[PDB]
Design goal:
Chain A: GO terms for molecular function: ATPase binding; cadmium ion binding; calcium-dependent protein binding; calmodulin binding; enzyme binding; flavin adenine dinucleotide binding; FMN binding; heme binding. Chain A: This is Nitric oxide synthase 1. Chain A: Belongs to the NOS family. Two copies of one chain form a homodimer. By secondary structure, chain A is an alpha+beta fold. Chain A folds into three domains: about 15-120 and about 150-160 and about 260-275 and about 345-370, Nitric Oxide Synthase, Chain A, domain 1; about 120-145 and about 160-235 and about 395-400, Nitric Oxide Synthase,Heme Domain, Chain A, domain 2 (Alpha-Beta Complex), CATH 3.90.440; about 235-255 and about 280-345, Nitric Oxide Synthase, Chain A, domain 3 (Bovine Endothelial Nitric Oxide Synthase Heme Domain, Chain: A,domain 3). Chain A is about 30% helix and about 15% strand. Chain A has ten helices and 16 strands. In chain A, strands 3-4-15-12 form a four-stranded mixed β-sheet, sandwiched between helices. In chain A, strands 5-8-9 form a three-stranded antiparallel β-sheet, covered by helices on one side. Chain A has a three-stranded antiparallel β-sheet with strand order 14-13-16. In chain A, a hairpin with a 6-residue loop joins strand 1 (about 5) and strand 2 (about 15). In chain A, helix 1 (about 40-60) runs antiparallel to helix 2 (about 65-80), helix 6 (about 280-290) packs across helix 8 (about 315-335) and helix 7 (about 300-305) packs across helix 8. The interface between A and B is large, with 64 and 65 residues. The structure holds protoporphyrin IX containing FE (2 copies), 5,6,7,8-tetrahydrobiopterin (H4B) (2 copies), N~5~-[2-(propylsulfanyl)ethanimidoyl]-L-ornithine (2 copies) and zinc ion.
Chain lengths: ~400, ~400
């Protein structure tokens, strides 16, 4: 019931008690681990509300206070009468910060308490949503000195009036299937791009076309908006030693902003809640650039480097991988756009993990996601045992809207 | 039930039914995943079911399930258990069991080779000297002048738990580690404790950076005894780099034969506490872990210094650059000397093929992603993108406590 985690590099042992406050289910059983699987009423709502308000009042050191009992009473009446309830600004801010604190797949959580929360619960239309999003984009980007932020649209009601951002991230590049047979641009975005085209987007059909936003308000049909080009900060990719690198014609955007997830606070569901921080280098240089089903550039780069590509054991892929990642970090730093390398990021996460163990009794962490996709064992998180469990408030996956939405 | 796994690079979806034959537990619950945790005498009563399920599997594999020979074997084992409290495997069952323990080993990326395993039956062994002889023969057979062959040597099973055979070494061949008075370590820091034990037992330590440890061997529950593997049987590879001529002057070498010796083999409820097995290296085990862990030889700094990388900031990726070069050197060196080794691209690609074949013909392939994914360049290997299901099938290889913690010293 009390659990130990060991670091095998340092021999440091930490004791986890926080997992006992765990609510949601993992996908694992006593018989089968699913650790590497990507996706494994009024009566219902009040326990969820109480659970949350209890942790909220405990955090401000007012547990069992009159003001605690009063709010619990208030929320109870509101659920009974209206079948839902509304969070106070304080509770919303606390909830959003804690959903991030609880994000077991996020290596950047040392930052969790420094989060700007934009309350967009007064939004009613897709145009309103677009305005809120541009303001988020501009605030967070901050001329390259990035600041974490989340923008929170109205909560789910009867589930027929959902707010959704149809994009998976606020800023992404289009993907196009070619007559040739190949894919132009980002192969991850082919289906979304087609939906944009079908809804009327005039596609430039280039390699790096910033997708339009497809915004859904109050369960209405989604609408298209183009983010002002001047608000989308992009970085051309060059290498500090290879002058040919720029000739590859590569660039990426500065703002990673996940827009397809669901924020659950006190049993309330925020289906539209785009949030953003800043990139760890490997996200672009390893995953976006080198996944075979993404921009898949390893071969071209290796060729420019004149590596022996005849045999896997020359480690030509590995050599080119390192260089691509050097070029990403270098280009972002030169243009003064916040980026973190995987050594620095994982080192900070270990410090955060120890902070969380001593101050909270644990830190839920998904090792499979936390360990960077290159140089795993030369980062300290590789050697760190982690326990994975689900705490609430949380960010949840949700089905893509085009499968749910009735037009 | 059916469980599906997806490869996110290829969209290939596989269906697992094999997990339904799993009996042992994982450490995980519906409330907590322990998938990154390193380590998460029976009765007649419990023994016969274990024997029976094993012999049912064995007899199905040979297409003789429910045969008279199958039924007679069950009766024979049942009577042996009732009468003696244990039973003896036939040589065929032992070979099958050992092959299956490997097939079922969810942390092993090399399992495409599972059916090609030389099994040495050492169940007639009675003394540490006898053990030493068996182990020398295994080393020589497996090494095969660099053309490595998978092998396992199987010593007598546990009886009352007071007469265990154990190899005290974690691997048959490993380098000594010595803690210095100034707190630095000479040699391999992983083996400091075991090295101290050896010295205490009377080993004369050379006290160098790459001293092959003596074997410490326990037979029949007796105090363990020291033996030096004949040096001529210990194949080693000096490490050099194909383009960097200074790499040789780091003084690095490694041994060719990885032979895990501290695990327990379970077959049909029987426990083989001494069962060293060996295959061949995947390059990263040496060039990433053994050389570049901070708690091991930790050579990253010295290599990057010699390469004149910018070491002032992590974001130059100097550690990553040196890491690749070190790993090129390990593969280059083994290949040049004609010692079997496999790179992490080849190994993982072979594992994916094995895994798909296993799904098709066996209904599953239990796999531990945390262990299967190599410790460098994770996502440019296909396994990173492969969803896996981890569960425990028998026969199996298990961890067991280090024997110096549990041994009752006789004197
Ligand atoms: C401040 C800098 C941040 C860094 C360096 C960072 C780092 C990361 C990384 C590397 C991932 C894995 C992404 C992937 O492989 O696709 C991740 C995932 C995640 N992060 Fe963070 N993050 C940051 C900010 C944030 C913020 C502000 C939030 C919420 C307010 C957040 C919540 C999450 C969640 C829910 C995931 C999992 C997303 C998914 O499952 O696809 N992160 N983070
Ligand atoms: C034939 C070539 C083989 C290759 C390339 C290979 C590859 C590997 C690698 C890279 C590991 C992880 C090692 C570590 O990180 O410490 C491993 C683990 C393992 N292998 Fe294999 N292996 C091979 C043969 C074998 C054989 C012959 C057996 C048994 C008959 C076996 C059983 C196991 C087991 C039980 C583990 C987990 C060990 C542990 O938990 O420490 N392997 N294998
Ligand atoms: C199958 C496996 O779970 C999948 O490839 C995961 C592995 N780890 C990951 N880790 C991060 N951070 N992001 C990812 O997309 C993935 N993909
Ligand atoms: C904490 C973590 O489970 C531990 O470092 C594991 C991770 N994956 C591994 N994978 C392999 N193949 N070998 C190892 O020793 C480890 N160590
Ligand atoms: C967006 C806020 C959540 S964490 C921020 C982040 N650093 N990455 C997020 C996911 C981006 C994706 N991996 C990509 O490489 O585009
Ligand atoms: C021994 C047979 C089981 S798997 C074979 C193997 N390829 N490696 C085994 C473990 C070696 C360790 N990683 C080392 O670097 O010495
Ligand atoms: Zn699990």
């Amino acid at each position: 019931r009390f659990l130990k985690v060991k670091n095998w590099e340092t021999d440091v042992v930490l004791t986890d008690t926080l997992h006992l406050k765990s609510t949601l289910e993992t996908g694992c059983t006593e018989h089968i681990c699913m650790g590497s699987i990507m996706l494994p009423t009024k009566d219902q709502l009040f326990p969820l509300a109480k659970e949350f308000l209890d942790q909220y009042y405990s955090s401000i050191k007012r547990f069992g206070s009159k003001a605690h009992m009063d709010r619990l009473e208030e929320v109870n009446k509101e659920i009974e009468s209206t079948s839902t309830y509304q969070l106070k600004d304080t509770e919303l801010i606390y909830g959003a910060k804690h959903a991030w604190r609880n994000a077991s797949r996020c290596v950047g959580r040392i930052q969790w308490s420094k989060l700007q929360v934009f309350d967009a619960r007064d939004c009613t239309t897709a145009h309103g949503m677009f305005n809120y999003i541009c303001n988020h984009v501009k605030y967070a980007t901050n001329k390259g000195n990035l600041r974490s932020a989340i923008t929170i649209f109205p909560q789910r009601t009867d589930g027929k009036h959902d707010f959704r951002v149809w994009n998976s991230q606020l800023i992404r590049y289009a993907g196009y299937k070619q007559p040739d047979g190949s894919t132009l641009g980002d192969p991850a975005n082919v289906q979304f791009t087609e939906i944009c085209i079908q809804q009327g987007w005039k596609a430039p059909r280039g390699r790096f076309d910033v997708l339009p936003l497809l915004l859904q308000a109050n369960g209405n049909d989604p609408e298209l908006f183009q983010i002002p080009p001047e608000l989308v900060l992009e970085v051309p990719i060059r290498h500090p030693k290879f002058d040919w690198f720029k000739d590859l014609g590569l660039k990426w955007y500065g703002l990673p902003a996940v827009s397809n997830m669901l924020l659950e606070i006190g049993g309330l569901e925020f289906s539209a809640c785009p949030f953003s921080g800043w990139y760890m280098g490997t996200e672009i240089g390893v995953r976006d650039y080198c996944d075979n089903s993404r921009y898949n550039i390893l071969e071209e780069v290796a060729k420019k480097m004149d590596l022996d590509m005849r045999k896997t054991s020359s480690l030509w892929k590995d050599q080119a991988l390192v260089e691509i990642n050097i070029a990403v970090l270098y280009s972002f730093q030169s243009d003064k756009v916040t980026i973190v390398d995987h050594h620095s990021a994982t080192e900070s996460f270990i410090k955060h993990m120890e902070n969380e163990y001593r101050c909270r009794g644990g830190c839920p962490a998904d090792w499979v996601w936390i360990v960077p996709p290159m140089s795993g064992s030369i980062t300290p998180v590789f050697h760190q045992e982690m326990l994975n469990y689900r705490l609430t408030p949380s960010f949840e996956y949700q089905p893509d809207p085009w499968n749910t939405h009735v037009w």
